[PDB]
Amino acid sequence: TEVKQQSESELKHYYNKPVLERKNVTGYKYTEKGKDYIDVIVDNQYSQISLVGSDKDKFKDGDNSNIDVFILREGDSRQATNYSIGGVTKTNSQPFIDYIHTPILEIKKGKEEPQSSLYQIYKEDISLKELDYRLRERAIKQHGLYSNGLKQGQITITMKDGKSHTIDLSQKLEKERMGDSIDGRQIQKILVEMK
Numbered sequence: 001t002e003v004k005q006q007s008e009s010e011l012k013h014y015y016n017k018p019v020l021e022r023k024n025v026t027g028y029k030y031t032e033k034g035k036d037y038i039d040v041i042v043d044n045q046y047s048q049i050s051l052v053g054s055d056k057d058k059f060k061d062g063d064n065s066n067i068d069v070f071i072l073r074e075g076d077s078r079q080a081t082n083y084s085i086g087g088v089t090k091t092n093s094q095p096f097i098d099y100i101h102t103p104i105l106e107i108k109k110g111k112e113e114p115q116s117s118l119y120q121i122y123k124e125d126i127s128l129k130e131l132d133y134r135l136r137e138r139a140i141k142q143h144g145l146y147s148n149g150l151k152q153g154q155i156t157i158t159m160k161d162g163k164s165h166t167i168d169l170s171q172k173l174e175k176e177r178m179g180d181s182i183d184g185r186q187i188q189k190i191l192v193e194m195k
């Protein structure tokens with residue numbers, strides 16, 4: 001496989017970027033030069049979010065006032081406006097406002113045995129962008145991922161129906177998958193393997 005070996009410094013820097021997340025907000029969806037975007041104001045901060053992939057046809061044009069956003073600034077720039085990719089999901093329904101789901105979370109480092117950790121899911125519609133960032137954040141902070149040459153491995157998200165979502169730790173998550181979302185009520189097990 002002829003894939004660019006991402007520097008662990010690059011992966012550390014990207015996955016340490018501050019996150020802007022808000023639930024039940026308004027975004028205005030539009031198409032600009034054949035590409036789909038959603039604009040959101042959070043605390044007088046402007047974000048333009050690319051809807052590339054599946055999320056492209058999930059939102060209606062114009063006002064979407066039932067959304068949750070997980071915003072990460074792409075690039076290193078002086079521009080005030082945030083440019084983020086995916087992480088736009090449907091907000092929880094009223095019966096599910098206080099919703100908590102605790103899937104199994106295990107983190108395995110090298111040849112060591114997996115270590116269980118408490119992980120809480122609050123969303124019915126959760127993006128791979130959010131799960132990817134938050135699981136890599138835990139692996140970085142507690143198990144030294146992207147330090148001392150620890151740059152390889154996998155994230156495995158297993159659903160109640162047996163379907164699995166795998167994320168390669170040696171690369172950033174695929175831009176197309178940042179807009180993909182799964183049923184948070186259906187996440188059973190999570191494994192973060194580092195090598």
Ligand SMILES: [Cl-]
Nearest residue numbers: 165166177180
């Ligand atoms: Cl997937």
Ligand SMILES: [Cl-]
Nearest residue numbers: 173174175176
């Ligand atoms: Cl990509």
Ligand SMILES: [Cl-]
Nearest residue numbers: 174175176177
């Ligand atoms: Cl992509």
